[PDB]
Paper text:
The cap intermediate is methylated by the RNA guanine N-7 methyltransferase, utilising the methyl donor, AdoMet, to create the mature cap, m7GpppN, and byproduct, AdoHcy (S-adenosyl homocysteine). In mammals, RNA guanylyltransferase and 5′-triphosphatase (RNGTT/CE) caps the nascent transcript and RNA guanine-7 methyltransferase (RNMT) methylates the cap. Human RNMT is a 476 amino acid nuclear protein consisting of a catalytic domain (residues 121–476), with homology to other eukaryotic cap methyltransferases and an N-terminal regulatory domain (residues 1–120), that mediates recruitment to transcription initiation sites. RNMT also has an activating subunit, RAM (RNMT-activating miniprotein).
Here we report the structure of human RNMT in complex with RAM. Two complexes within an asymmetric unit were found to perfectly superpose (RMSD 0.46 Å RNMT chain A versus B; RMSD 0.22 Å RAM chain C versus D). In the RNMT–RAM crystal structure, RAM 2–45 binds to a positively charged surface groove on RNMT, distal to the active site. This groove comprises of the RNMT α-helix hinge containing helices G and H (residues 395–415) and the lobe. The interface between RNMT and RAM was analysed using the PISA server (EMBLI-EBI) revealing an average interface area of 1695 Å2. Eleven amino acids in RAM spanning R18 to W43 are involved in polar interactions with RNMT, and RAM E25, R32 and E42 establish salt bridges with RNMT K392, E397 and R450. Many residues involved in these interactions lie in the RNMT lobe (residues 416–456), which co-evolved with RAM in vertebrates. The most overt effect of RAM binding is the stabilisation and resolution of the RNMT lobe, residues 416–456. Secondary structure element attribution using the DSSP program revealed the lobe to consist of a β-sheet made of two small anti-parallel β-strands (10a and 10b), which flank the α-helix L. The RNMT–RAM crystal structure in conjunction with biochemical analyses and molecular dynamics simulations has revealed that RAM activates RNMT by stabilising the RNMT lobe and α-helix hinge, thus positioning adjacent helix A in the active site in a position favourable for substrate binding and the methylation reaction.
Residue numbers in the entry:
A (entry chain A): 167 to 476
B (entry chain C): 3 to 44
């Protein structure tokens, strides 16, 4: 609830990211779209893929309870008898950093047009073999022209804040990051603690993107683009369909508040940027924005997309 | 397998997050980010 809009914004990011590359794939394929949702969680993206009209989805995760729960949502969606088409689906419990997915698929010859890895990649960089294995499961069975898309913390921003901090910790009322040590950052196994009041409290690993870029070349992948969350937003909101969606998903908080409602943050200067903004020649009100606290926590992330060469 | 790739990467990215890391140094020049603002939210 304190994090209500933080969630919606992140969901909007995935919607637009997924949306963009669904349109690209369909521009090339003109047939049944197959997608791998790697580290699917409890199925937060099930609805997104349903809206995207894909034909088959494969949901996989290390947490067996999550996967089945993901399966349960999907069953509930398909079992709600209406007119909407839904993808056929497949659910696999598996460590995608130590296990080969191709041996687990129903179809041994399975290929994908898109692998979607949202907020998962950095767990694989515990070691080289695990990182290579996840990259392999994500990219090797991609159809030529297919994509590897996802979201993961920006190590540049992480190290920036770490080294600027007085200690080995940094964060606020909403998130916390704790490195064991600064100055030393191994290519693999660079461990930090991550706590996001409302979503995670789970050790993560530093992902040096030039490294991920290099490792991905192993499976004939070229970089499509890599963007900070602000950059991706600044591009995507330039499209009114994306902007209307931003509102419908309530991905920003209305500002200023109604006399009868409340801002989400009680923190004293959490909305200074918004206040300063409407101190210029008049703004059309109300504003949509995010608390400074929430933005600090989510601006840490970047978006990436790789393409499978021909 | 691992024996070749890791030391290979260790050399390729030894400047990692240092003064010789041109990408990172460029990233440090970036102004602190302000949160998205949208007008006419209604
Ligand atoms: N090695 C691994 N293999 C498969 N899944 C993993 C994994 N390491 C972490 N995960 C999963 O990554 C997920 C991080 S949470 C993000 C959930 C989902 N991607 C979404 O955006 O809605 C967790 O569900 C976790 O079980």
């Amino acid at each position: 609830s304190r994090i209500f809009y933080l969630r919606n914004f992140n969901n909007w990011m995935k919607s637009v990211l997924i949306g963009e590359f669904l349109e690209k794939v369909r521009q090339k394929k003109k047939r049944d779209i197959t997608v791998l949702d790697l580290g699917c969680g409890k199925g937060g993206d099930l609805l997104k893929w349903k809206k995207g009209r894909i034909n088959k989805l494969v949901c996989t995760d290390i947490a067996d309870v999550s996967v089945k729960q993901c399966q349960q949502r999907y069953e509930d969606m398909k079992n709600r008898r209406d007119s909407e088409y839904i993808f056929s689906a497949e659910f696999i419990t598996a460590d995608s950093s130590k296990e080969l997915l191709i041996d687990k698929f129903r179809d041994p010859q399975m290929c994908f047009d898109i692998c979607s890895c949202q907020f998962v990649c950095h767990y694989s960089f515990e070691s080289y073999e695990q990182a290579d294995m996840m990259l392999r499961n994500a990219c090797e069975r991609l159809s030529p022209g297919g994509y590897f898309i996802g979201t993961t913390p920006n190590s540049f921003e992480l190290i920036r804040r770490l080294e600027a901090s007085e200690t080995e910790s940094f964060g606020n009322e909403i998130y916390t990051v704790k490195f064991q040590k600064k100055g030393d950052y191994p290519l693999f196994g660079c461990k930090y603690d991550f706590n996001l009041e409302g979503v995670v409290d789970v050790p993560e690993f530093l992902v040096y993107f030039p490294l991920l870029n290099e490792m991905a070349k192993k499976y004939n992948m070229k970089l499509v683009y890599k963007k900070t969350f602000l950059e991706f937003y600044e591009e995507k909101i330039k499209n009114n369909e994306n902007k209307m969606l931003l509102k419908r998903m309530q991905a920003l908080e209305p500002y200023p508040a109604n006399e009868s409602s409340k801002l989400v943050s009680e923190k004293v200067d959490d909305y200074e940027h918004a206040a300063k903004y409407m101190k210029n020649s008049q703004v059309r009100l109300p504003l949509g924005t995010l608390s400074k606290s929430e933005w600090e926590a989510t601006s840490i992330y970047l978006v990436f997309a790789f393409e499978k060469q021909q | 397998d691992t024996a070749e790739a890791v030391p290979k990467f260790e050399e390729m990215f030894a400047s990692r997050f240092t003064e010789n890391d041109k990408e990172y140094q460029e990233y440090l020049k970036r102004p602190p980010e302000s949160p998205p603002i949208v007008e006419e939210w209604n």
